[PDB]
Design a protein. Structure first.
Length: 289
C-alpha cells in the first residue's frame, strides 16, 4: 500500500506554498482561502484527506507553487518556478531517491498557456517535453506509481472570454492533451513495472460544464472575486491574482464555477477530488498508515 502523496503542480494544486513565501500577502486571504488559489481547500488536499482523515497533511508533500509551469524561456517572468525545480526539491530532500510507496502526481501546464505566450507551437512542444523529462527522471530515481492529469478546456476560463482568446486557449488545451496522452501511452509501454494512472480532466470538466446545474453551479462565466488587469499586467496568472480587489469580492459564491479569472471555486475542487478518488479506487490503489 502507498503511504503518501507527492504532488507537482501549479496554482491548481498549491496548498499554501506561495502564500508562505509571500508573507501571506498573495493570494490575499480573504478573499482567497488561507493562501490557496480558491475559496476552499484544493482538490489534492481533499483527496489526501479522503485517505487519511485524521492527519492528512503528514501524508501530503505538496511541492506545487502558484505560477509554476514548464520552463519556456519566453515566459521567464511569467513562470514563478519550474516543474523541474519542484522535482529536484523533492529529490534533494530524499537523498535523490523517489520512494516506491508514494503516489507521485503531476498536474502542470495551465500556467504556461494562460500566460498567453506569443509562440504557440514552441510552447506546446516545450511543455510536453518538460513533463516527459520529469516523468523519466522520477522513473529513473525509483518511482513506482505516477498519476498524470491533463488540462481542462482553458477556453472556458473567464480570462479567455474577457480577453477574446477562447480559440487560442482551447487550441492549447486540446493540443496539449493530445500530446500528453501520447506521452503517457509511451511510458505505459516502456515501463510496465510502473503503475501508470491518468485523469482526463478535459473530459471530466466538459461533462461538469454540460451538467453544471446538476453539479451545483449557477454561474459558469462570472467570477466570485473581482480583478482589474491590462495587457502588460494580464500576462500571468500571478499578476491576475495580485490585481484582485478584495473589497469587491462577492459574499455569496456557493454557485460560481470560477473564483477568479482562471481558478475554480471550492466546490469544483471538491468534485475534482471525488472523481479522482473514484478513478483511483477503480484502479485498486490502496493507502495505509
Amino acid at each position: 500500500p502507498l503511504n503518501n502523496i507527492v504532488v507537482f503542480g501549479d496554482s491548481l494544486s498549491d496548498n499554501g506554498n506561495l502564500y508562505e513565501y509571500m508573507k501571506h500577502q498573495l493570494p490575499q486571504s480573504p478573499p482567497y482561502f488561507e493562501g490557496r488559489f480558491s475559496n476552499g481547500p484544493v482538490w489534492i488536499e481533499r483527496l489526501a484527506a479522503s485517505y487519511f482523515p485524521n492527519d492528512p497533511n503528514s501524508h501530503l508533500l505538496d511541492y506545487a507553487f502558484g505560477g509554476a509551469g514548464v520552463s519556456v524561456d519566453e515566459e521567464d517572468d511569467e513562470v514563478f518556478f519550474t516543474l523541474r525545480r519542484e522535482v529536484n526539491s523533492y529529490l534533494l530532500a530524499h537523498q535523490d531517491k523517489a520512494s516506491p510507496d508514494s503516489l507521485f502526481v503531476i498536474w502542470i501546464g495551465a500556467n504556461n498557456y494562460l500566460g498567453m505566450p506569443v509562440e504557440v507551437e514552441e510552447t506546446l512542444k516545450n511543455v510536453n517535453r518538460g513533463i516527459a523529462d520529469s516523468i523519466q527522471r522520477l522513473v529513473d530515481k525509483g518511482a513506482k506509481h505516477i498519476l498524470v492529469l491533463n488540462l481542462p478546456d482553458l477556453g472556458r476560463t473567464p480570462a479567455a472570454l474577457e480577453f477574446g482568446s477562447v480559440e487560442e486557449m482551447t487550441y492549447f488545451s486540446a493540443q496539449h492533451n493530445n500530446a500528453l496522452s501520447n506521452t503517457v501511452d509511451y511510458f505505459k509501454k516502456t515501463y510496465p513495472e510502473v503503475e501508470w494512472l491518468f485523469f482526463d480532466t478535459g473530459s471530466h470538466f466538459d461533462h461538469v460544464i454540460e451538467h453544471a446545474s446538476e453539479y451545483g453551479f449557477t454561474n459558469i462565466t462570472g467570477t466570485c472575486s473581482f480583478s482589474i488587469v491590462d495587457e502588460i499586467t494580464k500576462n500571468s496568472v500571478l499578476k491576475m491574482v495580485a490585481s484582485v480587489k478584495p473589497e469587491l469580492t462577492e459574499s455569496a459564491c456557493d454557485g460560481y464555477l470560477f473564483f477568479d479569472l482562471v481558478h475554480p471555486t471550492a466546490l469544483a475542487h471538491k468534485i475534482m477530488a471525488e472523481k479522482a478518488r473514484l478513478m483511483l479506487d477503480e484502479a485498486g490503489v490502496e493507502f495505509a498508515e
